[PDB]
Amino acid sequence: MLDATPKEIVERKALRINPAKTCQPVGAMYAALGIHNCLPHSHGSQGCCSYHRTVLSRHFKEPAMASTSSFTEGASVFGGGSNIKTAVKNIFSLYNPDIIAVHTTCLSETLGDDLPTYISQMEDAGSIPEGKLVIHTNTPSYVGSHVTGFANMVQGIVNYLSENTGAKNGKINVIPGFVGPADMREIKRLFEAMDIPYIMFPDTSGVLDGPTTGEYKMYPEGGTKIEDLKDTGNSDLTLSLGSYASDLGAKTLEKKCKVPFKTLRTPIGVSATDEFIMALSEATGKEVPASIEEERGQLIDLMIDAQQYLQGKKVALLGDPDEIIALSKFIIELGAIPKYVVTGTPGMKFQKEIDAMLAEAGIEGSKVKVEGDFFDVHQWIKNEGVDLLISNTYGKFIAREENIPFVRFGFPIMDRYGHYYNPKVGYKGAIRLVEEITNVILDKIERECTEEDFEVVR
Amino acid sequence: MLDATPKEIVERKALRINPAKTCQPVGAMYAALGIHNCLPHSHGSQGCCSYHRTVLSRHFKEPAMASTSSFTEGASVFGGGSNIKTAVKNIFSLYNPDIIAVHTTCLSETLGDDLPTYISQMEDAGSIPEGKLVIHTNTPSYVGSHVTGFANMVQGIVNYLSENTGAKNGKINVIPGFVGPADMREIKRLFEAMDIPYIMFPDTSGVLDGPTTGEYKMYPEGGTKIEDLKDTGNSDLTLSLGSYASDLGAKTLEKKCKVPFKTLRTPIGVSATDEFIMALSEATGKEVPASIEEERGQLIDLMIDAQQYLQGKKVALLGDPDEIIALSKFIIELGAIPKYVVTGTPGMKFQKEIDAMLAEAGIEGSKVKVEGDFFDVHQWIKNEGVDLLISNTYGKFIAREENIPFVRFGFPIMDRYGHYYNPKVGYKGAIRLVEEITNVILDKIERECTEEDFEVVR
Amino acid sequence: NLKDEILEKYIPKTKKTRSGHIVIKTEETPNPEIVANTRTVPGIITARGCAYAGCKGVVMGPIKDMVHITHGPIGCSFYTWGGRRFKSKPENGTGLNFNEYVFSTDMQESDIVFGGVNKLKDAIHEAYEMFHPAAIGVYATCPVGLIGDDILAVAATASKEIGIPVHAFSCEGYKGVSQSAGHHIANNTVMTDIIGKGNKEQKKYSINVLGEYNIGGDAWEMDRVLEKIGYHVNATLTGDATYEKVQNADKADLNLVQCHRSINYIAEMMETKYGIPWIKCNFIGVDGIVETLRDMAKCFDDPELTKRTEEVIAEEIAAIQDDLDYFKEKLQGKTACLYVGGSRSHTYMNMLKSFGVDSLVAGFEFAHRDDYEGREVIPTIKIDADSKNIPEITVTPDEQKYRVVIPEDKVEELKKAGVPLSSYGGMMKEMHDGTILIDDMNHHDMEVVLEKLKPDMFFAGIKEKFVIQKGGVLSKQLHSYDYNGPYAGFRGVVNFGHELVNGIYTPAWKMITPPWK
Amino acid sequence: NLKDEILEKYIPKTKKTRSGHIVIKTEETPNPEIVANTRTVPGIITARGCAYAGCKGVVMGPIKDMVHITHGPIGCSFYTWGGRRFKSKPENGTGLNFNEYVFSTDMQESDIVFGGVNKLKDAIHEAYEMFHPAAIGVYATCPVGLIGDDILAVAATASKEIGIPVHAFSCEGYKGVSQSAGHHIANNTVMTDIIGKGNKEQKKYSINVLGEYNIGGDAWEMDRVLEKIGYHVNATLTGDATYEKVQNADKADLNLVQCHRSINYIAEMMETKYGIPWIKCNFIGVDGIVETLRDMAKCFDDPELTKRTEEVIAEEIAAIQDDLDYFKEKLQGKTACLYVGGSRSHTYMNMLKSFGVDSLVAGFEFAHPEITVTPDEQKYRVVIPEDKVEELKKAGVPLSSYGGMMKEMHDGTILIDDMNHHDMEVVLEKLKPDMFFAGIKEKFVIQKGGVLSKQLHSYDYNGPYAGFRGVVNFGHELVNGIYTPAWKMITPPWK
Ligand code: ICS
Ligand code: ICS
Ligand code: CLF
Ligand code: CLF
Ligand SMILES: [Fe+2]
Ligand SMILES: [Fe+2]
């Protein structure tokens, strides 16, 4: 397993191996599925759309609908204008979404396609039926990652939809960042327990974690309603969860509609969940109810009860920046050590936040890399080992080859069932994480001990 | 590991090895901690109380308070009357519970100690202060199991406290059986989602799964309140979940207070949860809400999504009768086979119920045994292997020796952290069960496949 | 009429273009003309992929000791990371195997604006120095031609410096209309620059299996039976292949063509250049396996081979007959539809029919007219604007290596005995009257079929699986095999049947409706 | 003062009995009279166990190739199923090891009403035929005497039919007042019916370690150091012991007594009967370990053994010194209380003191047939001649005697016999110690209050804690506990 990976590290500046990111468009496709009755649309060659729909189905074990402009060599010479006008005509009549959310590929971006022009030409020709909507964003794959793509699509939604009409709704907007449907559900549950009215967007709960009822519905029950997306411009405040995924939209909404915003870490672990709860309380004067305080105390109880298996444990983490920042802090809060910490998504923020929390905890000797990949981490592991690995499915190779306890986290997870029902955020999610971590640590201890070291209680 | 277990079998009628039960009193202590401000009391030699407190702490990673009559050799001659009277004086003055819930040991039962007399003498002598209560049950360890002990303490609660005052409360009583605090939480959540007023008793939620707040409270915030236990005689109906743990109390309540009852299976799996929900609907005329319907449809989605890993899998199960009956049903509902099915608790019902479901599914060649033990199951496995083992912690020896995917379930689980926060009942609990089953099946496949049979998607 | 029901909702322009892609095989016209290999209608919700998928992801990727470098932004590389289940083992237990890696140049904005050729050059050298593979591949993606990168020249410059082959593939995603264009692009370079470059000596009874990618171990199961009968499997293009085996592909006497769509260019060109004849290989389902093995025996015309062929067939059938009987008892009378890429539809229909299951509709992503109706229509076909750009390679006989493998006398007698030497009659030839075929099937089409025919099962891919299953209908995957297999060969019929019966009889299908409804 | 704060809430009668059980050990009275070994006050929330736990669970159970049958209802057996962490390995890789099993007669109502001797006889025979062990043990529980079962006779009859020893132990739970009575019951039968039945040849520099149960691998660690120096460890009673090694315990020249409370009857009787002297073994903490090793050296009085002893000590300490300095830097200045069963209180206090941790309160659960032996004719021998004993004592080696745990503790230490929940909570509230070591029943009670509680019985599922490597394990786990970040996150930020 991974035989070709040398132990000795030679300088590597061009060849990317086993990436810790994918390209923008699927992040925008995911955001778009968080709008009710929306068809995502991929403006480019159809290979992209098929691959992007595919990963979402492998991760969620659910349908993932989207259409494409299907560029051929013709569009490569003359641009994709005619392709997208043809698409929109077929989409509204065959499939009747309420809104089409268009993103782009490396192909249409390299060509410089002018979506705002095609869209106003479509309006003029009457190709967009009364009461239907077409929105877009630009998602060049050679910039950033899928996280950037999600961020760009959220900006698109506010560019086209959000309007301040004078009629205050008394609500808080929450942009949950690039997180799963179970996390969106948990964030909503906590708003509801504090008694705070809100609008969450995007929201993929009830879209990518849906029931089997015996009838297939092209547009599932969930997703934020268009009418509420319009209403986000009448809210009191926007909470932006995860700066990489969420800030662009929150800042855009502030510029466009004068809704102030506050940036928070993705609420994974103790401090980051505490900061989210304190923000809700400070913004509304509402008290923290007993239910929420009990959950927190149960998390603390677990952290203390299980402490011996966690203290000083060296952890390798790979993933998306917002989530890996928050999770790294939780690892430190558990008494463990983020040893190797990598994201494939470019940006200075990650390096600064990880370096800072490591210094605060007195931890020296860790490696933190922005635009690093799984091959980097594997080589690092061969030089100095770790006790725990946390990443998406693609860490399984390292986990097996190096015999490391492994926790699946982030995107995509394509090889276990039900993860899309399991929160990782809030006090409830933190409990789940501690269970998973201690479970795999204990499993290893028990697989490998001699029979004479075998234990009934742990 | 367990090298002394022969493969070839010689019938044992006297030597019990690695039992699939323990004695009544811990079940009674557990039921008692399900009463608010109650101190459980062990009427016998102090070694029992120490062992019984200890297993509850090993299982819950929590305090488990109880007092004891501390019989000495003298009691073996003059009975335990004087010991309990002295105990009660010390308990009220030092520890000041609102109720002392007494159970017995094999020693007091063998001696024929007469608790009703001692209690009425303490009453007459004034050793029980104004507003305080002492209740008892009889829990001979040579009869039945810990499940019988729970049943008996529930009957004791009813015998002493339940009163029909003519003042209807419009509530349904629910006796949840010998299940964990997370199961009690889930059952209550479902009542609340159905908008149905209820009294649950016993209720260990908030007692054996409680937070760390920085201050130790001898009597945790949870437990059913004495005033609500009295009020159980004014309810419209009692739901008895799991006949072994709960019918005795429910029948005793019908005879004493004229509250009718219905007996339901512990709500593990699809049919058993559906039966609980339909009973609640039918008793109240309340509609089943969208949230519960969505949960069920998610369970169904999961059972279908993960079907290939479950179909035809041979499963060995050991544990307590109400839980194993309902879990065996769920195993069949998953498309799998209950191959070896054992409880250490005596009674005909287990045998009948399991035989019946195997025959309904066309399953032959399974072995079902009442008053079997882990040594039995190990021998059977050596003759014909299984794909999955489900049992308490003590299954881990067989799991390791025979290399079998292993799911911890039931009582006691002393070697992982957080299980007492994880429901196994309802649609939510069934989802957690399916996740655990499919995870351990998948982990084994991946651990043992050759490198060229290694897989990114499953 | 199902065709009319499918077409009804399309707008006029679309209805007119789609109508020709739906046909029905009848007794009156058993080989109906179909419109195929045209551009996808924008917005219609296709399952098709791109030419890069066809080239890198499908044909070239499985060559295990060649480093495959995607020259593009990161997604093109990420989405070819283990999703397609070609199986590989290290040759002789020790050779290089890069199956667990994906390699790329990870193009950034600077590469788009200023050209990416310097980064590609550096990446090729880094791969060489780190891994010393047998060869390197460089695969174009959407931006590559547009930004001006000459990958052919970068590759040739690198190859001279590093001393191993470097092959460039211009498989930009927008070329052609589907994966098919990618197959063609790969075949051209494999033929001209890899096949015949080796020097190994030919063994007796040597065959190649062409257009076989060892998905889920299929090729190893094929090889198990072929080697038992007595053949030497010289090369499999390209499932579990080493570079050097492809280089020695010319060292065979007969080419078995499993996937005609993906590998027919190489089959034709090897016949022209080296004299090696081919036959269609149908290694899915008992009927196809047996016919393939009997056809092979007759080509070699060896009394021993022939006797062994019959002994092995008889013994492999006897070992699975109890399972076959079980499948039929459990499944007969059920109905299915299937949706494939470009091949295999009739063999799966035939395997299903051996279980008593009738197949009503066969959908396709991207099969060509020659795949449906036979190569005899290749003269009548005219390449439209969208596919005319893909080079058509021409080879000439190798004076020194050419050989008459089977004399023309024997070739004539074989065709009279029913052996289709160096020909292929198409998928529809074999299908039952009443079969409805849909080229470039889409979501709308699929949903009409489901609603009107109510099949018990609809076999497809990962994008459609959960769509079909949400409606209560079983959908087993024909590409990934739901992470099992093999499905090819004698043991494959058992794996397929076992998994199918397990799927149909899963209890949850009957629990979907809650008891309060 | 503390004694009076603890006593305050007790009702008058309880107050009077409990007063004698709490003492403050000072320079005025270097060892004040404590009341010990009295009945537990009913309802007071003790931690004590029963005589069956002391006999089967503690002393006898660790004998790995003997089948221990519990004669009683199922619980007595169930609660001795792996909770006490004596470690065993099969002898020479191949011998019998029953550590993962518990065996019972699983008494039912019919056994209570009509007697259980017939079920016990069948269970003995089934165990013999199924496992062919070195011996079988039969252990009484609460109902056994009362229902009229003569387990002595049942054992004797079965031993004669099956041809291996079957030992009956009348360890009914209600006997005595604590696990201590169970120790005594086991010791009598081990001394009279097992020790001395062997016939193996005695080796040079032979020692036994008595009252050592190999919890978490303790005995293997102590053997490592002892065998390095050059002793032959003849027998450990009973950690990782075979039945045969117990039978050959008389084949040694010196008995080390680790747990004096549990094994003193055997130490005293082996001296009387075989003339093997003993010394107290304190193999916890560097000071105890080195003092133990220097006393053993003085007893053999062999110049090479004495030299190797000092060489081993120096290198063992050198190997861990950096760990010990780290523990002191991280822990000095903190305070501890301890709560043990019957032993070890002072060794742990000493080890804690070597890290700069001061111990304020030491609690105990219970530290304090009567048989007589006489010199074996064919086997008695003077191992250390008459006044060589005198030479050793005048040079600080207490040969064949023990001073008591209290005489060696610093002044001011408060001691509580049969400590109860009420007492413990007063101590926690008044003294506010940084840590309070105890057992599983107390651990979560203490830790709910924001105080670290590492277990002194189960070692929190780690170990060894004995020996040189044990000091490092203990210190490492202790530092990890104190510095767990969650302790400082208990209060939420909205408070
Ligand atoms: S190559 Fe083709 S789409 Fe012939 S691109 Fe596709 S591994 Fe399909 S129907 Mo995936 S023409 Fe192979 C195919 Fe068939 S990837 Fe595989 S299953 S037999
Ligand atoms: S025998 Fe005794 S309670 Fe001396 S009954 Fe108890 S394995 Fe304790 S303080 Mo558990 S007199 Fe041993 C003991 Fe000490 S079980 Fe262990 S730790 S040194
Ligand atoms: S049709 Fe085919 S897969 Fe698509 S891009 Fe083009 S060659 Fe490639 Fe690539 S990086 Fe992402 S996945 Fe695309 S938007 Fe570009
Ligand atoms: S003091 Fe000791 S442990 Fe107690 S019983 Fe008595 S010998 Fe035994 Fe046994 S079966 Fe259960 S645990 Fe008791 S109530 Fe009886
Ligand atoms: Fe699903
Ligand atoms: Fe706890």
Side-chain angles (χ1 to χ4, degrees), chain D residues 66-131:
Chain D
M66 186 172 171
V67 165
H68 304 292
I69 308 172
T70 290
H71 187 47
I74 196 60
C76 305
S77 181
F78 180 89
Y79 296 107
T80 60
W81 194 4
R84 178 155 176 271
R85 298 179 56 251
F86 49 88
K87 299 311 196 164
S88 299
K89 49 177 210 177
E91 197 76 352
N92 286 325
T94 55
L96 293 164
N97 179 17
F98 303 108
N99 253 42
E100 307 151 340
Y101 303 90
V102 289
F103 298 102
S104 179
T105 57
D106 188 14
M107 282 185 184
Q108 296 298 298
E109 176 101 51
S110 61
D111 304 298
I112 297 300
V113 175
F114 301 103
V117 294
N118 186 250
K119 198 171 192 187
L120 175 60
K121 166 175 170 287
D122 291 345
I124 291 158
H125 284 271
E126 288 176 355
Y128 172 73
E129 296 296 335
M130 196 167 334
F131 301 112

Side-chain angles (χ1 to χ4, degrees), chain A residues 1 61-62 185 209 212 294 297-298 301 305 396 400 416 418 422 435 443 446 449 451 455 458, chain B residues 1 62 185 209 212 294 297-298 301 396 400 416-418 422 435 443 446 449 451 455 458:
Chain A
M1 191 131 298
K61 309 307 185 196
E62 292 287 280
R185 283 175 190 265
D209 64 352
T212 285
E294 182 185 55
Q298 288 170 320
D301 195 76
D305 288 348
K396 76 193 296 182
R400 168 164 157 128
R416 290 298 181 274
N422 301 171
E435 291 177 345
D443 280 346
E446 302 189 341
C449 65
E451 306 184 2
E455 304 293 338
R458 299 254 185 209
Chain B
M1 178 159 293
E62 294 285 285
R185 286 186 192 256
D209 63 350
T212 286
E294 187 193 39
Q298 288 170 322
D301 194 75
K396 75 188 296 175
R400 180 169 143 146
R416 298 294 187 265
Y417 290 81
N422 308 339
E435 289 174 340
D443 282 340
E446 305 194 329
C449 67
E451 295 156 310
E455 301 291 338
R458 303 261 189 199

